[PDB]
């Protein structure tokens, strides 16, 4: 199973950011204009028309599947082993071969 790690959405008021990429699985950058974040303290910043929000997220292998997982194999020819009983009156042995 996978997981969606989402770091914090750094918001810049009356400015703009530039997201330098990362060698990572599906590092996805998105920059939005025209935001008005309204948190507990009234507004977060004080500006009206140049606000930008940065949201970044990536997809990563979950932490528990070190113990459960499916594994696909290619499957080729096999071998054969046997176990026999060899009783002929004189002492009866068992054998694997």
């Amino acid at each position: 199973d996978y997981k969606t790690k989402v770091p914090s959405p750094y918001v810049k008021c009356c400015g703009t950011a530039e997201c330098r990429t990362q060698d990572k699985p599906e590092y996805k950058c998105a920059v939005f204009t025209g935001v008005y974040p309204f948190m507990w303290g009234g507004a977060y910043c004080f500006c009206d028309s140049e606000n930008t929000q940065m949201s970044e997220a990536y997809v990563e292998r979950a932490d528990v599947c070190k113990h459960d997982y499916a594994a696909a194999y290619r499957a080729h020819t096999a071998s054969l082993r046997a176990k026999i009983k060899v009783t002929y009156g004189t002492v009866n042995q068992t054998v694997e071969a």
């Binding site: 914090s8 507990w40 009234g42």
Partner: protein, 261 residues
């Protein structure tokens, strides 16, 4: 006993989707997710406030910690509840994480009473269907029969090899600073560090701690901020970050799952 690992950790208040009904107040009862990657049926719920540690960093059994008005307060654990459709019992309380077993349903929720004697709750959509083991469809552990292999969580409250990261609160907006005069503003009442900023352009932002006067403008021009940290927080996706984008702190994920019957 010692296990300390936490000395710089502070709760937060985040946003949620229900607060009893409809009005989605930014509440102290965030739920980040519900991990259900075990096999018995239990749920490992991680929520906003943290439990087990008192105000100034000491191991407790029955007192819990939480936040209100960006200052620290406490409550009790014996008055906390978790349920989905019917009241289900908690099975373990440690640090920042809730641990329980619970019947099916389509919602999960946590609640506890406030130090102002209230009943703050929080609900969040999540589907929990009874995952079955063996070739039967039971619901309760019987007394006669056979057993089968299965994974579950262990109550060892100090164990390594899993973690989340920690950051610091960026800055806390407010307009509710003691700043009022007839044509002027009065520029603090506080006990901590503050960064002020405005747009009546004669003086830039600064890091004052004593009172000032800006003598000029009506109050709907300046907005104030709490500033640099004393402790750390969790990089929850619901509060922004400052320009210190790092991985300063990190903290145990307790209860590693192990083979059982």
């Amino acid at each position: 006993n010692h296990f300390n690992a936490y000395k710089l950790t502070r709760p937060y208040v985040a946003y949620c989707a229900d607060c009893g009904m409809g009005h989605s107040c930014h509440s102290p009862a965030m739920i980040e997710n519900v991990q259900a990657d075990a096999t018995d049926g239990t749920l490992k719920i991680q929520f906003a406030s943290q439990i087990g540690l008192t105000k100034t960093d000491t191991h407790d059994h029955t007192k819990i910690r939480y936040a209100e008005g960006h200052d620290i307060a406490e409550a009790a654990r014996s008055t906390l509840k978790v349920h989905s459709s019917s009241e289900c019992a908690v099975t373990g309380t440690m640090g920042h994480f809730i641990l329980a077993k619970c019947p099916p349903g389509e919602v999960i929720s946590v609640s506890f009473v406030d130090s102002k004697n209230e009943q703050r709750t929080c609900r969040i959509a999540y589907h929990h269907e009874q995952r079955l083991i063996g070739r039967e469809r039971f619901t309760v552990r019987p007394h006669h029969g056979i057993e089968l292999p299965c994974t579950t969580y262990q109550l060892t409250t100090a164990e390594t090899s899993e973690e989340i990261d920690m950051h610091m609160p960026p800055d806390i907006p407010d307009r509710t600073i003691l700043s009022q005069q007839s044509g002027n503003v009065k520029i603090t009442v506080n006990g901590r560090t503050v960064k002020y900023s405005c747009s009546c352009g004669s003086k830039p932002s600064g890091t004052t701690t004593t009172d000032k006067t800006i003598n000029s403008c009506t109050v709907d021009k300046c907005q104030a901020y709490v500033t640099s940290h004393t402790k750390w927080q969790f990089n929850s996706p619901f509060v922004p970050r400052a320009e210190q984008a790092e991985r300063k702190g990190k903290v145990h994920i307790p209860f590693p799952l192990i083979n059982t019957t």
